Write a protein that binds this ligand. Structure first.
Ligand SMILES: Nc1ncnc2c1ncn2[C@@H]1O[C@H](COP(=O)(O)OP(=O)(O)OP(=O)(O)O)[C@@H](O)[C@H]1O
Ligand SMILES: [Mg+2]
Length: 275
């Protein structure tokens, strides 16, 4: 990662906490193309140095994925370690998290918009699959909306997938349980079961969120009931927009070896019309 001077970062707004992170909107002063001085809007993800294992996992993850440039993967500009903390400097995505976006717009988007976003996410995941890179933190909050749909020009919404964060192989078991049903059953059983199949399961859960207006699946269940949900091998209810219900269930297969490849997922979508 490109090292960014601490004096070149300004923190403007707090955006709350993530998973052992503090997140801010800020500005980076930089020399850009043609030597132009810019003040670029940035997302700053702050990790405490004292949480050494978490920080190492987080930055290893961000670093590996950032070696893989793709139009649907978020851009990281660099890192700043020369402070009291370790900071990831990321592009600021104008329309924020997809789940929030769907809530704020009262789910007034049509099925074709949802399908377009699903196809974009699937394209990102196929690229990661071909690169044998496990993300491990796919969910609608981690889908960032770059651009809204434009009816006049016919341009679809455009998304990027966030950095992976701290690996579920290092996070505390209680956090994994809270993350049912994004974390698949085999990882609740042993986090070492993390695999490319993991992201197929989480993709299914993410599609459920997209089709449910940014609702969270199993929100009414505490962690003990979420464990019972997997014990009894339940599936999620068909979402409000039921068009993707079959694909959701096929991806959320309790047998990880039976989850379809992302190429197969993409074909199914097209046919509708660190660790
Ligand atoms: N690149 C970005 N641009 C704009 N907003 C962002 C960006 N990344 C995150 N956010 C916003 O920051 C807030 C915190 O994000 P989030 O909970 O995903 O943090 P995190 O550190 O990535 O945690 P996790 O690993 O659980 O995803 C949310 O409001 C989210 O929309
Ligand atoms: Mg995130």
């Amino acid at each position: 990662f490109h090292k960014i001077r601490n004096e070149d970062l300004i923190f403007n707004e707090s955006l709350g906490q993530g998973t052992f992170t503090k997140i801010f909107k800020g500005v980076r002063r930089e020399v850009g193309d043609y030597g132009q001085l810019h003040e670029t809007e940035v997302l700053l993800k702050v990790l405490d140095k004292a949480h050494r294992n978490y920080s190492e996992s987080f930055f290893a993850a961000a670093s590996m994925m950032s070696k893989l440039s793709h139009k649907h993967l978020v851009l990281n500009y660099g890192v700043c370690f020369c402070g009291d903390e370790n900071i990831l400097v990321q592009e600021f995505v104008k329309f924020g998290s997809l789940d929030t976006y769907l809530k704020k717009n009262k789910n007034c988007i049509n099925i074709l918009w949802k399908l377009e976003v699903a196809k974009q996410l699937a394209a990102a995941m196929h690229f990661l699959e071909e690169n044998t890179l496990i993300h491990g933190n796919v969910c609608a909050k981690n889908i960032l909306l770059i651009r809204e749909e434009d009816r006049k020009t016919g341009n679809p919404p455009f998304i990027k997938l966030s950095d992976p964060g701290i690996s579920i192989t290092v996070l505390p078991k209680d956090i994994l349980q809270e993350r049912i049903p994004w974390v698949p059953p085999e990882c609740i059983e042993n986090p070492k079961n993390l695999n490319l199949a993991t992201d197929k399961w989480s993709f299914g859960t993410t599609l459920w969120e997209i089709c449910s207006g940014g609702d969270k699946p199993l929100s009414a269940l505490d962690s003990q009931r979420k464990l019972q949900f997997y014990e009894d091998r339940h599936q999620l209810p068909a979402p409000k927009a039921a068009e993707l219900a079959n694909l959701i269930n096929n991806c959320m297969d309790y047998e990880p070896d039976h989850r379809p490849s992302f190429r197969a997922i993409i074909r199914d979508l097209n046919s509708l019309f660190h660790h």
